[PDB]
Every structure is written in C-alpha cells, then in structure tokens.
Subunit: 202 residues, 2 copies
Amino acid sequence: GHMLSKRDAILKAAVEVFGKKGYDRATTDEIAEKAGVAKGLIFHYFKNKEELYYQAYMSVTEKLQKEFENFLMKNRNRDIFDFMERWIEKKLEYSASHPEEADFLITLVSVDEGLRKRILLDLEKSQRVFFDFVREKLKDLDLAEDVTEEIALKFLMWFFSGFEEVYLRTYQGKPELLKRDMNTLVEEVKVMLRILKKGMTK
Amino acid sequence: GHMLSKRDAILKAAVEVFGKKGYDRATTDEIAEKAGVAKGLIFHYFKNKEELYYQAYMSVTEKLQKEFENFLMKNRNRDIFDFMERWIEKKLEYSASHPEEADFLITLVSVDEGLRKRILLDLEKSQRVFFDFVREKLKDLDLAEDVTEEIALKFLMWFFSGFEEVYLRTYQGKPELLKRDMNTLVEEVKVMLRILKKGMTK
C-alpha cells in the first residue's frame, strides 16, 4: 500500500510533536522516531529544527488558504457580518476535525522573534486576501457618523482573529469539548457580530 | 548604600531574562549571573526554574493587583464603559513605564500546561475582583432585548483582556513605540468601547 512520502511523514510527526510540546521543547530526534525515519533524514530534507517548523507551518497554512479561497468564491457577495459568521462556523468545524493542526498553529507565539517574524512576513500575502476583502466590503456599510472605515476595519479584524486565538487556546488538546460547545459558540458569535454591526452602523 | 535583597535581585533578573528569552530558553545560570549571585543561590531560594518563574509571576501580578485595587476604590461609582476606558489608559501608562514587567507577563502562553494551569488557578481569586465588579455593574445597564447579561459579560471581558494581550505582544521590546502611539490607541479604545455600548444597549 501507498504510504506518505518521507517528507510528508516527517511533516505529520512535526505537526504532532510541535503541537504537543511547543517549538522549544520539541526535539528533532523524537520527530524522527515518531515519523519512523532515520535521525539523519531530518537534516537531509529540512536542514534544522527551525526550517522544519517553518515548512510545517507553511504546509498547514497552505491547506487553510485553499479552504478559504473555496469559501470566498462561494460567499463573496454576502453581507460582511454574514460572511464572517459563516466563515467562523467553517473554521470551528475545521479545527474540531483537524485537532492536531489546530494545536500546532497556536504554537507560533512560543517561537523566537526571528522565526515568528519570518513566518508572519511570508504569510502576509495570503492573510491580506481576507483583509483586503473586508476592507472593500466596509465601503458597502452605512457607518455611524463617528466611526471611521479604519476603526471598523481594526475592530472587525481583531474580533475575527482574536475569537480564533481564544477558542484554539481554550480547547487545545480537547476536541470533544469543542464539539460539545460548538452550537453554543456559534450562537454566541452570531450575537456578538450583531452587537458589532449595530454599534458600527447608523 | 541599600541594595535589593538577594531574593529581589534574583526576581528582577528573572523578570528580565524570562521577558527576553521566554521560559524554555531562559537559563537559571544566566539569571544568577545577571543578578550577581552564586549559581547555588537560585536553588537556595527558589528550588528550580519552574518555582522561580512562578514566584516572579506572582510578585509582578501582586504589584498590578495593588494598582488595580487603588483604582477601583477611586472609580467604583463610574459607568462601566467609562471605568474600563479609564483603567485601560492606566494599564497602557503602566506598561510603557514598566516595559520589562510587560514583556515578562506575556510569556505565560509559552510555559508548559502544568505550570500555566498552576498560575491561572492561583491568580483566579485576584482576577475575579475585576470580573465580579463588571458582572455587578452590568445590572445597571439597559441591555438590548436580545442581549443577555452573560454575552455582555463575555464580550466585555474578551475586549478588555484581548486588547491588553494585543498591545503587549505588538509593542514587546518597544516601549518608545507604545509611548508614541498611546494617544492614538486611547482614542481608538474610546471609539471601540462606544461601539460596544451602543450595540449592547437599548
């Protein structure tokens, strides 16, 4: 039978180990053992632990970017709050079904400043797709006289990205709890987004 | 001349080193060197790196809790949004003037689950003072018919604690940038809190 390529096997194990232990504590030797590959193969394909973490982070985010681009195509004409609510539902469902990936993504805060900055620089183009979309949609919003497009944008992007950081951190290692709470979380999101819309608009 | 006690000297250096390097990377040997104490003195007073981090975290939060209790006494009768806006201004001013302490506090996310949980358990009583205050003040609010006291509470506590996490992370190591941006940040906070109040209330 077909198995994962050795690179993909190493990436899988890396996602697992880094999600469980964080970047600093994780060891390349235990990643290789988990992947079932000789210790030297990690150098062969990924040079060092920093590059391995980088490649894993880019591999997982590329999958997420594909999910987003598919959603965006189908939902681009929606009201922005409606869009955000629906996308948040999808991200919750994805995180519950990809708990190892979810635990892995939240480790970025743990890494040293050089590596974190490298990743954030390299992800900016992909993350800007959603940002620029919200920015264009805010033109369709009838904003309160005292609320600038800039504050609206800042607040909405914080809500969206902060909600994600909170639930990933809260349910880290506990996907059955996320699944138990998702109906509640979704109802809560709907109300919070309604509060933001009402407060932002005329 | 009077110098710091050896415990306080070690705690000072620990705050510095942990803020700069995170928990995992920081070494007790470099903390002792920075503190000007023999390497054995860290064991003598703090047993291990985990206990040292714990004691430093508790020492810094105790200072912050005193600042909060002083503010609360003077401001308890205020409207809750007004209260929050004013407290956020004070926390911004404190972080700019205590940049080492600020950088240190944000490292909690980096530590292993056992230590993080220990700290969160032990801080719950102190953090509940503010939480319970917001909860009582929400009774004075004329909430929209569709907004429960529970969602209001959740949303306000996320705004307050999330804003703090974002600015501490954003300005980590850069107190001159925080000082340059504080007037802007404060104006932004005022508008966001106004948006929340409008959206939450009748």
